[PDB]
Symmetry: D2
Subunit: 156 residues, 4 copies
């Protein structure tokens, strides 16, 4: 059981919130960076980011976050699309996450990505894409998911 600030909700040690106002990818990442983690002394230690996803389970959860938060927006197609922190560079195999975590989970819908270079990933909650990711263009305006800074104690 995970501890998250009010209005956020937690799965495996990370804390998520779905934001409802449509922003393009950049400003969506930026919105997320307004959240942070500071030391009690006062120093800024880290920043929030667009959610990164690392497993079938993480992915199933964020799908449910979206599908139950937005049940009226669930179409038979791709829609709704919600941004996650996925960036796709020149080759389709230049996938990074904005938080700098590593792409160790593949949740693309069959055929995706395919609008590269410099596309961005989104949960596509429609009954077609069934939650799995689609890549879209950076200036598309959508709902987004943030994660608060991911952090653990080192006791070595």
């Amino acid at each position: 059981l995970t501890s998250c600030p009010p209005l956020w909700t937690g799965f495996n040690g990370k804390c998520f919130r779905l934001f409802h106002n449509h922003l393009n990818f950049d400003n969506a990442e930026n919105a997320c960076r307004q959240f942070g983690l500071a030391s009690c002394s006062g120093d800024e230690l880290a920043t929030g980011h667009l959610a990164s996803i690392h497993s079938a389970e993480s992915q199933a959860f964020l799908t449910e976050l979206v599908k139950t938060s937005l049940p009226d927006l669930i179409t038979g197609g791709w829609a709704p699309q919600v941004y996650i922190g996925m960036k796709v560079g020149s080759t389709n195999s230049d996938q990074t996450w904005t938080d700098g975590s590593s792409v160790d989970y593949d949740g693309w819908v069959s055929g995706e990505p395919n609008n590269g270079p410099n596309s961005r990933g989104a949960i596509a909650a429609g009954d077609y894409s069934r939650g799995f990711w689609a890549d879209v263009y950076s200036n598309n305006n959508f709902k987004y998911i943030c994660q608060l800074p991911c952090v653990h104690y080192t006791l070595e």
Copy 2:
């Protein structure tokens, strides 16, 4: 900082979730009672309920839960109305919460309750009622808020 299951969200040691499917008051209380707290041994110890509210702060929070969860349904009136666990019996001063907690916080809108006997309270998130409660009829069908069983350690 409160610990809540995934998809739920926490304020001051209680855990809340907003449900989107419209139910009448009874079945909304019931839906919440499907969630519980059991001992590790196996015995059911307690049940979830429609949220009860005990302070300006609790009430402000649930108001933001609804306002941010549902920004498209926010009218200039009273709507949207989301059920909480408030029951109003024969006199208007017979107010009880469904969890059995005590009515030590008055969050009614000016004029409310007024549809007694046997009306039920709802956060009315419209800009007019600004979150505060309205009493409506038990068979009206609305979105609801649950709280998971409320418990604390006794160390005496």
Copy 3:
């Protein structure tokens, strides 16, 4: 990561404290029952008990609790012995835990139990018994370990 009241310490969802004043088995279980879990409404829901142990890991932890809490009391023999909630009845195979959990872990030292009927188990932290359990007589007076009531949410 587990959430426990101040002065207690947590491993896998349960909360432990080591108590320093020697009591016999009965009064040790009793001391633990002074701690409880109540609903916010006010009703007593459950009681603390002498710790029960369910795996190599739980057992390794409680061993470390004892060994690091009491490093001056660690002898080359059996001592120090700290009560856990283990009861041994008529046959040596009538092992129950006081919290009513089930005996699914065997942490007896080689040869133990062996002072039945109606002996009780204790972590024996000395370098000989290396933490594993010894059974001793009910009226022996020792330090003890409590656990706060064990509970989880049922979401089925």
Copy 4:
């Protein structure tokens, strides 16, 4: 209710552990710095320190930590003295904490500090000093209290 690693114990969002092996102030600060907080990505973000104390309530708690952890060492005098992260420079009014937090709580015993320049504070749990601090010399060898890195989410 605070979330702490096993063997630690929490009060108001910070996590404390009492260590039993006597070290001088420097090495005691250092021992605490072996604990840290890193990002999931892998970067070291912050370090543990000797506990700092910021209120009557914090101080009451740490006093109970020491008094209940070491009931056999509690003399009618000052002893036992346990280090906290307090440093006293040239004037007696140059008090800093090792974590960098600010000295907004005065918990010195009547008359203390008095062994400056460059003395260090310790909870003096003896019945005389009743928990409050004493300044002692940096090369004295005592038990110490660590706190894990103190952090909170910034949501602004």
